[PDB]
């Protein structure tokens with residue numbers, strides 16, 4: 001620390017936002033912070049736990065990017081220990097995708113169109129996540145849990161990458177429990193991770209392709225038809241995911257580039273970003289023929 005601190009008197013808890021196996025989240029007001037405003041603070045079911053606290057906090061202060069969830073600091077004066085995050089109006093990206101497509105019948109508010117998310121908004125979401133992964137790959141930080149459930153959405157449809165937390169709880173359909181003390185998002189993992197237990201930046205690229213998949217299917221779980229073991233089988237043996245139907249061939253071409261068996265044979269995340277960004281800012285005329 002080397003970590004910003006926030007006095008408790010500046011933080012006023014309003015109500016709970018969510019609850020994890022080890023942490024709670026409250027929506028709260030935070031005074032004398034900027035330049036008054038709303039923040040999301042997390043409390044800790046302390047057990048030991050006071051070690052991983054000032055570990056995550058130091059990391060989050062190092063990770064400052066336009067597409068990584070902002071971290072304002074901590075409150076260590078007294079208990080419980082708090083981490084002050086910025087508040088993202090629309091919650092996690094998976095809940096946002098499911099609630100806006102393909103029905104979605106009107107269903108859009110202040111930041112989002114009525115019906116299902118347009119091709120331009122889908123590409124805009126993917127581009128932002130890729131942009132966040134380029135940053136993390138630039139610092140050689142491996143995420144090991146890249147999914148929509150770990151991405152937050154704020155006002156003006158700002159997508160930012162984070163790491164729950166909540167994910168382990170009530171999203172347990174997305175995890176395979178092994179050993180009793182460890183769960184694995186095997187549906188998002190590359191073959192060299194499932195088999196060889198190896199996680200690299202190239203493993204994140206595979207994960208992003210699966211995230212890029214999710215976006216164009218509105219939050220639907222990968223290999224939804226399959227069980228945990230069956231999903232492992234298909235990924236190991238080298239089965240690829242479907243594309244229908246909001247995904248243009250040009251975009252599915254990007255997913256497969258992330259889904260090469262050999263990690264070195266995959267494309268860089270900077271490359272994937274470049275293609276997704278161009279497609280995002282491309283004119284309607286170009287996008288209507290995709």
Ligand SMILES: Cc1cn(-c2cc(NC(=O)c3cc4cc(c3C)C#Cc3cnc5ccc(nn35)NCCC(=O)NCCCCO4)cc(C(F)(F)F)c2)cn1
Nearest residue numbers: 017018019020023025040042069087088162163164165166
């Ligand atoms: C191994 C390792 C990983 N990291 C690492 C950790 C991280 N942390 C995180 O992303 C993190 C962790 C966390 C909470 C939040 C975030 C963003 C948040 C938030 C937030 C802002 N507005 C809202 C509105 C509703 C909700 N949350 N919310 N739902 C309530 C969530 C729940 O119901 N349970 C969540 C409570 C418990 C979780 O506590 C981000 C990154 C990185 F990706 F940014 F680098 C890396 C550090 N070490």
